Design a protein around this ligand. Structure first.
Ligand SMILES: *[C@@H]1O[C@H](CO[C@@H]2O[C@@H](C)[C@@H](O)[C@@H](O)[C@@H]2O)[C@@H](O[C@@H]2O[C@H](CO)[C@@H](O[C@@H]3O[C@H](CO)[C@@H](O)[C@H](O)[C@@H]3O)[C@H](O)[C@H]2NC(C)=O)[C@H](O)[C@H]1NC(C)=O
Ligand SMILES: *[C@@H]1O[C@H](CO)[C@@H](O[C@@H]2O[C@H](CO)[C@@H](O[C@@H]3O[C@H](CO)[C@@H](O)[C@H](O)[C@@H]3O)[C@H](O)[C@H]2NC(C)=O)[C@H](O)[C@H]1NC(C)=O
Ligand SMILES: *[C@@H]1O[C@H](CO)[C@@H](O[C@@H]2O[C@H](CO)[C@@H](O[C@@H]3O[C@H](CO)[C@@H](O)[C@H](O)[C@@H]3O)[C@H](O)[C@H]2NC(C)=O)[C@H](O)[C@H]1NC(C)=O
Ligand SMILES: *[C@@H]1O[C@H](CO)[C@@H](O[C@@H]2O[C@H](CO)[C@@H](O[C@@H]3O[C@H](CO)[C@@H](O)[C@H](O)[C@@H]3O)[C@H](O)[C@H]2NC(C)=O)[C@H](O)[C@H]1NC(C)=O
Ligand SMILES: *[C@@H]1O[C@H](CO)[C@@H](O[C@@H]2O[C@H](CO)[C@@H](O)[C@H](O)[C@H]2NC(C)=O)[C@H](O)[C@H]1NC(C)=O
Ligand SMILES: *[C@@H]1O[C@H](CO)[C@@H](O[C@@H]2O[C@H](CO)[C@@H](O)[C@H](O)[C@H]2NC(C)=O)[C@H](O)[C@H]1NC(C)=O
Ligand SMILES: *[C@@H]1O[C@H](CO)[C@@H](O[C@@H]2O[C@H](CO)[C@@H](O)[C@H](O)[C@H]2NC(C)=O)[C@H](O)[C@H]1NC(C)=O
Ligand code: NAG
Ligand code: NAG
Ligand code: NAG
Ligand code: MAN
Ligand code: MAN
Ligand code: MAN
Ligand code: MAN
Ligand code: MAN
Ligand code: MAN
Ligand code: CA
Ligand code: CA
Ligand code: CA
Ligand code: CA
Ligand code: CA
Ligand code: CA
Ligand code: CA
Ligand code: CA
Ligand code: CA
Ligand code: CA
Ligand code: CA
Ligand code: CA
Ligand code: CA
Ligand code: CA
Ligand code: CA
Ligand code: CA
Ligand code: CA
Ligand code: CA
Ligand code: CA
Ligand code: CA
Ligand code: CA
Lengths: 554, 559
């Protein structure tokens, strides 16, 4: 059938000047002579929003009542009827579309009053940072809804490092590089415009953007101290040598900023310890060992600075680790007298051919440690158990009082020890102790003698144990060599040697007669030496009844 | 079916921005996937005026091409079609009316540059004088065509005595009464306006109307204040006596203004005739009968004045006829001698016993008409055929010259007529004639005599007719009495009276022989008189030849 021409009406205006906007009518009223009542139905009449359209039952004319708004109603598809007096259709109901024409009656508005994004420092060009957005409620795919995003102002404005795509709202990084040390945070006011995106004096909606620039370790540390010299006193420990103040441009607090240290050379002795003070970013070096001013050790050392986190690839190999030298000066302190060595060893001999009672054999001179010169003092002897030595009270010269005896009970590991003290003149009177190590030469002045030359065994005895004693130390005692001699003749076969050891021997009589024998030995040193005295063993073999010692009278 | 809502377009305007003004379409194209072509027909496309609308065969859109003028085309009733490729209908053709909206783009204009109308004087209020008209070609029954008639300027502007209905254009009279004697014609300029009848500085078309106030006789005539005496002469006729001048306020020339006259008293004799002069409005009185100064010296009379037309009902019962005095005196004229009567009667007799030859028997005295006295004149006889009279030239005395005879052939009806003339002395000779009628007494002096005493009849005749003659007038002639007398004896018995007429008689003789006879009569008068002479009839009976005359010889004198 025929399509009824649709009606066009503009939004947001009074349309009373266009009424009636439409009129339906049947030719069955005049030609066929029937009273027909017209009525419409549809959105705006029988459906919401109500009270938009009204109609005359008799004429069939249409009427606009209110102002249309296409943002709420894009079109009205209402239908007209022609009814008889009863209420039935005399004509097939027609559809009449009413199109509402768009007008640009609402501005683009941002989804947020404030946008926030972040981008890393030294980012490549055209790196997407973030994206802003807005919406326009007007007719889609028309200039009334085409948004154009623009940058109003910027901080710190110059230079420009952000490009705002006006069509997409995307923000990119430009070809100018970002440097956080130049500008950490960018705050930016944007704008959204309607139509053709033409900048006019019209006040349009605007939001703000806040971009935070992230940090990278692209700045090498630098020492700020003018004078770099350490300072410690003598005989001190756990003291502050120096504080190495270092500057770093990167983000304060971060591992990209935190100073970090390593000894290059000079601390092989382990005299220093270094650690970074994270609050002042100072390298704290301290003494972990006492130093003697007089020994005059050079404690100078060198150190290398870097960041706790590695350097950015952007700056690597542009960095050469150059060791930073640090001289350290030491303070002298009045210490008073001392000995050039706490212990001294003087070597003496047991023989008279070199050692003699009353010969000088050394001194224990006390020096003033500060000036290193000999100081006037009063020396005194100490703990001389067997009175081997004499100490002069003034000159400190030491001389023997006896001939040393290596075999003495007071000698241990071949040494005879003696303490001595020295006292200074004037105040404050200081007392220092010394030690002398008297190493006595062991000479072979002892020969192997029997400890039990006379003894008496049982008849059931299995063997006899002969044992010797040479008080001499190695090698002047060592293993003995035993030798039983044939005196009287035949006896050498009567008394055999079964087993021998280093200082003893086992002896077995073959025939096993019961009586006393005089058995001479020649027991010789490891050097071959032997006693002038004859080593004789008087052994009496007795008849032992079990339990008892020896038989009686019978 | 559904009637398509018509589309409206304003005339006298460019409609390009409104195109396409309309569009038809079928849903059979989209649903059925068929190629359809649309087309329109009607006034503006296929009928004149042409090329006003054009249409797109494919879309079905309509367009207007030129500027419209609804005064030429009020609307366009065209019809749309939907056709397939073959050329047949896929939809019922719909009617699509295109209405043209009016604009007030032409002004009201009068049917004529000038109107003329008429209204009678002192007409009642709201009397329709006339009607003016104007036309507006714009849409009927709209303010664009509602005309408003108004009076621009009137002369005399004041007072307002005309009301012009702005809606109808009709002109009426107001309660202020019109007086044509004050103002005869109103010339009047009117105007016609468009819209709601609002008077603006806009130049609108204007016309002029001319109104004539027609006259009515509502003003009574008035005569001058002088006495109007007149004077005519004696023996004059058809002469102007006087001119009665009369004034009248009504329309000059009209019968409401024309003086009119009726005689009140003094013209019973029919001596005067009056007729009004239409140019001067004067009453022209003229003498239509001669007057005698000796008999009448004054001819005074009266007339009353009115109008030729009747007075208007408004002014009637206010008019009171006042007779106008007209003294007119007659002037004497020398008329000279005259007779106190043109005719005289004189009685005379035929007998000598009273009338005598030479006796005075009357006079014909001439009098001087002016003085009434007897005047000296010379009198003379006239037409006296038989000389019966002598008239004295000096004294006018009349006397016989002969004895009058009643039987005279010159006498007629017993009267004898004779004229007389009198001539005056001094200059000029006036001559007057008189008449004297002389009546004569008839006396019995004639006797009945026979006219033919000698006769000759035939023997075939059975009677003979004898006749007498008495020349006297009645009664002295009258009937006769005849008597045949016995002389000689015997005659009386043979000649017998058969029958007698008044003046004659016939006789029959018994014997009737052939010969002459002597028959004596005594014929007596009606008075008894008879002739002194013997009255004898000599009758000769002759043979006759049964035809006529006497047959034989001597009875003829000669032949
Ligand atoms: C034959 O005789 C020697 C000599 O000793 C005598 O007889 C022994 C049985 C012991 O009673 C001795 O006290 C006595 O002098 C035997 O002695 C051996 O040597 C010494 C003691 O003589 C022992 O040496 C050791 O010393 C270390 C520290 O220096 C200790 O920790 C040990 O406890 C021990 O004292 C050694 O033990 C001892 N030998 C033994 C007991 O077998 C010797 O052994 C005996 N036989 C032979 C074949 O000569
Ligand atoms: C529907 O809308 C139509 C169009 O606006 C309205 O119809 C028209 O209404 C006006 C206003 O009453 C009428 O004109 C008026 O005339 C009066 C006096 O005649 C005058 O005082 C006003 O200033 C105005 O000029 C007009 O005749 C009428 N019809 C048409 C065809 O225009 C109507 O009021 C609306 N309502 C309904 C119920 O349809
Ligand atoms: C920029 O703003 C736009 C517009 O707001 C965001 O786009 C989003 O578009 C979605 C479509 O997915 C819309 O929400 C959706 O509605 C449809 C039907 O109307 C529904 O089917 C989906 O389930 C969803 O609800 C919406 O218009 C819109 N979102 C908002 C919050 O408005 C876009 O995400 C924004 N950009 C950024 C970076 O936030
Ligand atoms: C404007 O219309 C008027 C009135 O309708 C016409 O003029 C007047 O018309 C009347 C009616 O005819 C005239 O009266 C008489 O008309 C009859 C027709 O039956 C005619 O036979 C008579 O002789 C007489 O004319 C009237 O006189 C006439 N006059 C005037 C001054 O209007 C006319 O159509 C238009 N205007 C004019 C001014 O004519
Ligand atoms: C019918 O009316 C339309 C206007 O609605 C005319 O169309 C335009 O004509 C002008 C001049 O040629 C141009 O703008 C375009 O060619 C047409 N369309 C548009 C959208 O502008 C059309 O000319 C009219 N009459 C015809 C076609 O005969
Ligand atoms: C003036 O008007 C009078 C009255 O209208 C006229 O009078 C009549 O004249 C006729 C004709 O002879 C007589 O029969 C009537 O008797 C008259 N009537 C009256 C009332 O007098 C008169 O003729 C007019 N006179 C003139 C000269 O115009
Ligand atoms: C005698 O003759 C005369 C004339 O010839 C006649 O007289 C007649 O008288 C009558 C009166 O009765 C008159 O009319 C005339 O005088 C005569 N007759 C006429 C005119 O016809 C008459 O005929 C004779 N008389 C008689 C017969 O008695
Ligand atoms: C920083 O300290 C690290 C351990 O945290 C240690 O290896 C060195 O002293 C410094 N730097 C590097 C790279 O090792
Ligand atoms: C000194 O002697 C004892 C016994 O001879 C021995 O065990 C010790 O090892 C020696 N001292 C040292 C340091 O060896
Ligand atoms: C005579 O008088 C008579 C009678 O009236 C008349 O008939 C006749 O005409 C008159 N004739 C003459 C001449 O007088
Ligand atoms: C150290 O030795 C003695 C005691 O140990 C003191 O008396 C002396 O003066 C020195 O200070
Ligand atoms: C060394 O020796 C004695 C102890 O034997 C100390 O008391 C003295 O002061 C010195 O330091
Ligand atoms: C020798 O040894 C003593 C302790 O036995 C020390 O105190 C002294 O200083 C010396 O070195
Ligand atoms: C009238 O009559 C005669 C004519 O007969 C005139 O001549 C005479 O003069 C008188 O006037
Ligand atoms: C009367 O008679 C004669 C003629 O009859 C006139 O001519 C004369 O004037 C007189 O008046
Ligand atoms: C007598 O008769 C004559 C005519 O017969 C008149 O004219 C004359 O005036 C007189 O009256
Ligand atoms: Ca809107
Ligand atoms: Ca909108
Ligand atoms: Ca918009
Ligand atoms: Ca940087
Ligand atoms: Ca950085
Ligand atoms: Ca760093
Ligand atoms: Ca020191
Ligand atoms: Ca020191
Ligand atoms: Ca020894
Ligand atoms: Ca020794
Ligand atoms: Ca030894
Ligand atoms: Ca026009
Ligand atoms: Ca018009
Ligand atoms: Ca008047
Ligand atoms: Ca008048
Ligand atoms: Ca008059
Ligand atoms: Ca006279
Ligand atoms: Ca006179
Ligand atoms: Ca006579
Ligand atoms: Ca006589
Ligand atoms: Ca007689």
């Amino acid at each position: 059938a025929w399509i009824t021409a649709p009606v066009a009406l503009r939004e947001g205006e009074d349309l009373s000047k266009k009424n009636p906007i439409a009129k339906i009518h049947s030719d069955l009223a005049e030609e066929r002579g029937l009273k027909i009542t017209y009525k419409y139905t549809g959105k705006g009449i029988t459906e919401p929003p109500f009270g938009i359209f009204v109609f005359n039952k008799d004429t069939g004319e249409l009427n606009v009542t209110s102002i249309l708004d296409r943002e709420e109603t894009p079109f009205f598809l209402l239908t007209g009827y022609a009814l008889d007096a009863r209420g039935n259709n005399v004509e097939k109901p027609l559809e009449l579309r009413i199109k509402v024409l768009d007008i640009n009656d609402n501005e683009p508005v941002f989804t947020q009053d404030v946008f926030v994004g972040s981008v890393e420092e030294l980012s490549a060009a055209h790196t997407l940072v973030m994206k802003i957005n807005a919406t326009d409620a007007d007719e889609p795919n028309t200039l009334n809804s085409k948004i154009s995003y623009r940058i109003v102002s910027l901080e710190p404005a110059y230079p420009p490092v952000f490009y705002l795509n006006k069509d997409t709202g995307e923000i990119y990084t430009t070809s100018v590089t970002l440097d956080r040390e130049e500008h950490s945070s960018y705050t930016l006011t944007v704008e959204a415009r309607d139509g053709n995106g033409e900048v006019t004096d019209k006040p349009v909606k605007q939001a703000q953007v806040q971009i935070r620039i992230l940090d990278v370790n692209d700045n090498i540390p630098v020492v700020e101290n003018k004078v770099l010299e350490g300072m410690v006193e003598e005989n001190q420990v756990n003291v502050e040598v120096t504080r190495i103040k270092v500057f770093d441009a990167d983000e304060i607090g971060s591992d990209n900023w935190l100073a970090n240290f390593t000894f290059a050379s000079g601390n092989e002795g382990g005299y220093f310890h270094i650690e970074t003070d994270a609050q002042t970013n100072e390298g704290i070096v301290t003494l972990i060992k006492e130093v003697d001013y007089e020994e005059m050790k050079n404690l100078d050392f060198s150190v290398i600075v870097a960041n706790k986190a590695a350097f950015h690839k952007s700056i690597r190999s542009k960095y050469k680790p150059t060791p930073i030298p640090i001289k350290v000066k030491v303070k002298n302190v009045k210490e008073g007298i001392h000995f050039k060595s706490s212990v001294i060893s003087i070597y003496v001999s047991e023989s008279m051919d070199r050692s003699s009672k009353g010969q000088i054999i050394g001194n224990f001179q006390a020096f003033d440690e500060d000036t290193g010169l000999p100081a006037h003092a009063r020396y005194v002897k100490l703990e001389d158990r067997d009175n081997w030595i004499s100490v002069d009270s003034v000159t400190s010269e030491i001389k023997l009082a006896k001939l040393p005896d290596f075999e003495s009970r007071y000698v241990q590991n071949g040494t005879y020890t003696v303490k001595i003290v020295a006292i200074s003149e004037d105040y404050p009177r200081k007392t220092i102790t010394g030690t002398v190590l008297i190493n006595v030469e062991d000479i072979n002045d002892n020969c192997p003698t029997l400890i039990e030359p006379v003894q008496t065994i049982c008849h059931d005895a299995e063997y006899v144990n002969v044992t010797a004693e040479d008080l001499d130390g190695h090698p002047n005692s060592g293993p003995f060599s035993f030798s039983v001699i044939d005196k009287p003749p035949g006896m050498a076969e009567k008394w055999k040697i079964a087993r021998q050891e280093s200082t003893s021997v086992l002896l077995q009589q073959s025939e096993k007669k019961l009586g006393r024998s005089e058995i001479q030995f020649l027991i010789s040193d490891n050097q071959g030496f032997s006693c002038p005295e004859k080593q004789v063993l008087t052994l009496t073999v007795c008849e032992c009844l079990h339990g008892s010692g020896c038989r009686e009278a019978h």
